[PDB]
Amino acid sequence: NLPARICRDIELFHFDIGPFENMWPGIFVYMIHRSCGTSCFELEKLCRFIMSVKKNYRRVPYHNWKHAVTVAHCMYAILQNNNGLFTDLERKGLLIACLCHDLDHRGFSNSYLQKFDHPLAALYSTSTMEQHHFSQTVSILQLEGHNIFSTLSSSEYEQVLEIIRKAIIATDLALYFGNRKQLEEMYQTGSLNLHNQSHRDRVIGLMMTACDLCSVTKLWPVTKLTANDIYAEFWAEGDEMKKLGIQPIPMMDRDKRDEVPQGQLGFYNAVAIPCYTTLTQILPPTEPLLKACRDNLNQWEKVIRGEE
Amino acid sequence: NLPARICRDIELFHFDIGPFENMWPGIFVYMIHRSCGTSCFELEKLCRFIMSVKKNYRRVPYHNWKHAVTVAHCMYAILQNNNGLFTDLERKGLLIACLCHDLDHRGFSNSYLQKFDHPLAALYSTSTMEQHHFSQTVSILQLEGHNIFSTLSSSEYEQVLEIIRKAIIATDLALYFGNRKQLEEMYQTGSLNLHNQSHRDRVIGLMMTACDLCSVTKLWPVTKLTANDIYAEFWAEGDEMKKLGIQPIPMMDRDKRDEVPQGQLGFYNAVAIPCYTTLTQILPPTEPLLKACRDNLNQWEKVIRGEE
Amino acid sequence: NLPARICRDIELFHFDIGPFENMWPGIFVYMIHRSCGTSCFELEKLCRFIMSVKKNYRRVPYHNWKHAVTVAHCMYAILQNNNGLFTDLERKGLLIACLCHDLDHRGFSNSYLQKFDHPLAALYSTSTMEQHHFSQTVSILQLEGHNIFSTLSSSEYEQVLEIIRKAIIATDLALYFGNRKQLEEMYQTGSLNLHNQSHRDRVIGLMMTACDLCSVTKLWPVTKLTANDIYAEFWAEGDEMKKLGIQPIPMMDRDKRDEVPQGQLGFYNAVAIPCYTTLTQILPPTEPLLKACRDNLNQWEKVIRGEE
Numbered sequence A, B, C: 001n002l003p004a005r006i007c008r009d010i011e012l013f014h015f016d017i018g019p020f021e022n023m024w025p026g027i028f029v030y031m032i033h034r035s036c037g038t039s040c041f042e043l044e045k046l047c048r049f050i051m052s053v054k055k056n057y058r059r060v061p062y063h064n065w066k067h068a069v070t071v072a073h074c075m076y077a078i079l080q081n082n083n084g085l086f087t088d089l090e091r092k093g094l095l096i097a098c099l100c101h102d103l104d105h106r107g108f109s110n111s112y113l114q115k116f117d118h119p120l121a122a123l124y125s126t127s128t129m130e131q132h133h134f135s136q137t138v139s140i141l142q143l144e145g146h147n148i149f150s151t152l153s154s155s156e157y158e159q160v161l162e163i164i165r166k167a168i169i170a171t172d173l174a175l176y177f178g179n180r181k182q183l184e185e186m187y188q189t190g191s192l193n194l195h196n197q198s199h200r201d202r203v204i205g206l207m208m209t210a211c212d213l214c215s216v217t218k219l220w221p222v223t224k225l226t227a228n229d230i231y232a233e234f235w236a237e238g239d240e241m242k243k244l245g246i247q248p249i250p251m252m253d254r255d256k257r258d259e260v261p262q263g264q265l266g267f268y269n270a271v272a273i274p275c276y277t278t279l280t281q282i283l284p285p286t287e288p289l290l291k292a293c294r295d296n297l298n299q300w301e302k303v304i305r306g307e308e
């Protein structure tokens, strides 16, 4: 079914899923089959699920269907290089969580929705969007012919939905910083315990962050181009901010676009590098993600000093 | 249903309707209910109407669904601050006219359609697009389950359709100049008579112009950004003009984009300021529209002299 | 049905089909009727065919539905100015081939699909896309109510599908160079024989090239603007190339966009001028296509030396 190069390269952390949208669902199915065997998801339901999820992603520059699949791939690479650490249901739940983690994203951050006084901010006070992304996942599961978890027991159903809920909520980067701080203290004290469910939850949350930010772990040309999509959303949000009468944070002001390289150094130094560093400590086979991140940091440093 | 901020701010003339498309129909329904009570439009038909109208707007940069709703809002603010001046049917008709006034707009002016020898120019010699926008409104009303005026008598139906026809045709800016000149002489002579149906018609036409141009009555950041959308259409039309072998008017030539500030001073001085000035004379509670216009004129003057 | 200007201008080689998408199918039907009479295509099936073909074109900057119709028009002008040279079925087949020749084009060249290891490259080793475009044409013909060739005999059906297959495959510009070389030797030796089916096939292939490149035979403003769409695709492909780790050919590198004028001189000198020159030798009434091409070459030369 899938090409030769894709079957080889899909195992690489820095794999790009390519421009051909119609290939991505099969990419995702292949990944699902190759983690949880060909035997646990009914292929007609699964594809009906995938295609409905795709439909509920929006045509935004970055937080789109392609991002969903790119994020799911990263999890696949992590899961594939840490065999026997996670359960069958976890590998299912995490792959589906990643695919659905940005469902119905409109390009705006939680802060804007708050400032806009959006209805979703009234419903979900914290992790507004991420709570909506989970709510959307449920609703798609509850469509006729879409319940990909019908073969599971009721207990396993609740279990996997809880795995998915927590993993999607972890993609709220506001939660990353505390999580990663906790995990860092657990590692340095030697107290991190993967048999501890609370600890597992945090490690899963950090895995989710690592996957969500994985654009920074690709090769320079991919990383550089995706950066345009990211800022295209930030600047559109800064515009909407100015339309509300609020002077947006500099990152979101297209008039300050000359400062993108500096904003990137900021992001890598405060978020990306610490994230992959901590993940590599906990899961050493994720080293390539960190190496690629360090490499892209140097590229941004080359950009800054005029060597682009 | 609607957010707290929106319920407060929607009463302000300079209210922006925001980036969330799915909120606009409820914004429009709220406005309709709050002008004509919750009791005269059957909510299932009304929403079926609104969603069909939305479907027949095109994905053009400016004359799109968002513009339709923005224009309808302005009318709502005018109508809300001039209570008892207009009838129930007028407030209904004008709100619906505004929503439908640009139905099936493809980003091109009447002059281009003429020069293109477009079929619609053969059907409607004058006010080509505006006659088509009305024709489109009728056709959507005549869809099964879409006749939002079924509770009305036949007489009131004809009446309201005539209100709508005239108001949509008034959005042809070629007609503005004569209308506003007449209204200006009627005011200065003391002969303007709102009990005179012919006079009312003109005032309604000027209200329609004021609403249609209301982008110039928003706060600078909104006004400035919408200006890009306006010129994005003008330049696309100037391109099509050059493709016909006709050197377009400078406003429509993207090579002369450096002259946008001057074109804006031209527009405000000849069209916008006179329009809101005359409206404020006739309807004093519309003063804020004029103040905002004067403010934006100064911003364009700041742009011109390099203070942006 | 069609406007007055269009009925006049549609006979001109450099006719632009305009910005109004909804007019193009009638433009194509008019062209089909005016080549093969109003009597051989059943209008309800034909329009069902046209609208299905349109649906299977993608929203890419250049190789889109508009291009399809523009290419079909050029064939119409060639066919109209060389009466009695081609058969009824040929004129049908070639008009339909042109409409379908880029069906499901995603903006990428055969080389990229190859380098990507795309599945279509496995199915069709040579002329990958063009073989897929033909495969897509067949599939649309085989839809219920879409078989526009049902009035034909089985023999004439095979015949016309073979005409279409060869003409679509000829739009692979890799094949142009050999074809045109052969045709050039046949002309200079006096051995070209239009009663020779093999020779006819080549002339048809060159006609297809001439139609496909016809953007270079329009008036400067059309030619210049379409060039942006062409490079918008090339640069997107060069991006995807860099994402695969391959440094793309300079034409496809947006960083080398300053070299577009030179790339154009290259293209006209090596491909376009030779193509129309050879066509004018074989079909003298196609001279205007060559004149327009030479004119645009001078415009590109004016651009180069700073006279834009």
Ligand SMILES: CCCc1nc(C)c2c(C)nc3ccc(OC)nc3n12
Binding pocket: A173, A212, A213, A214, A215, A216, A227, A230, A251, A263, A264, A267
């Ligand atoms: C919401 C996007 C998070 C995210 N994902 C990636 C790949 C990025 C990148 C490369 N840069 C960012 C800079 C600031 C920021 O602030 C939120 N987020 C960034 N980001």
Ligand SMILES: CCCc1nc(C)c2c(C)nc3ccc(OC)nc3n12
Binding pocket: B173, B212, B213, B214, B215, B216, B227, B230, B251, B263, B264, B267
């Ligand atoms: C058709 C657009 C009318 C219109 N609405 C707005 C808000 C505008 C603005 C800000 N500027 C304009 C400048 C020229 C012009 O000429 C037609 N129309 C303009 N316009």
Ligand SMILES: CCCc1nc(C)c2c(C)nc3ccc(OC)nc3n12
Binding pocket: C173, C212, C213, C214, C215, C216, C227, C230, C251, C263, C264, C267
């Ligand atoms: C695939 C596009 C063929 C094509 N059609 C037109 C009208 C063009 C033009 C104006 N320039 C081209 C320059 C390079 C190139 O290389 C392929 N193809 C070009 N091209």
Ligand SMILES: [Mg+2]
Binding pocket: A101, A102, A129, A171, A172
């Ligand atoms: Mg998110």
Ligand SMILES: [Mg+2]
Binding pocket: B101, B102, B129, B171, B172
């Ligand atoms: Mg209009």
Ligand SMILES: [Mg+2]
Binding pocket: C101, C102, C129, C171, C172
């Ligand atoms: Mg092609």
Ligand SMILES: [Zn+2]
Binding pocket: A063, A067, A071, A101, A102, A171, A212
């Ligand atoms: Zn995400």
Ligand SMILES: [Zn+2]
Binding pocket: B063, B067, B071, B101, B102, B171, B212
């Ligand atoms: Zn309007």
Ligand SMILES: [Zn+2]
Binding pocket: C063, C067, C071, C101, C102, C171, C212
């Ligand atoms: Zn083509």
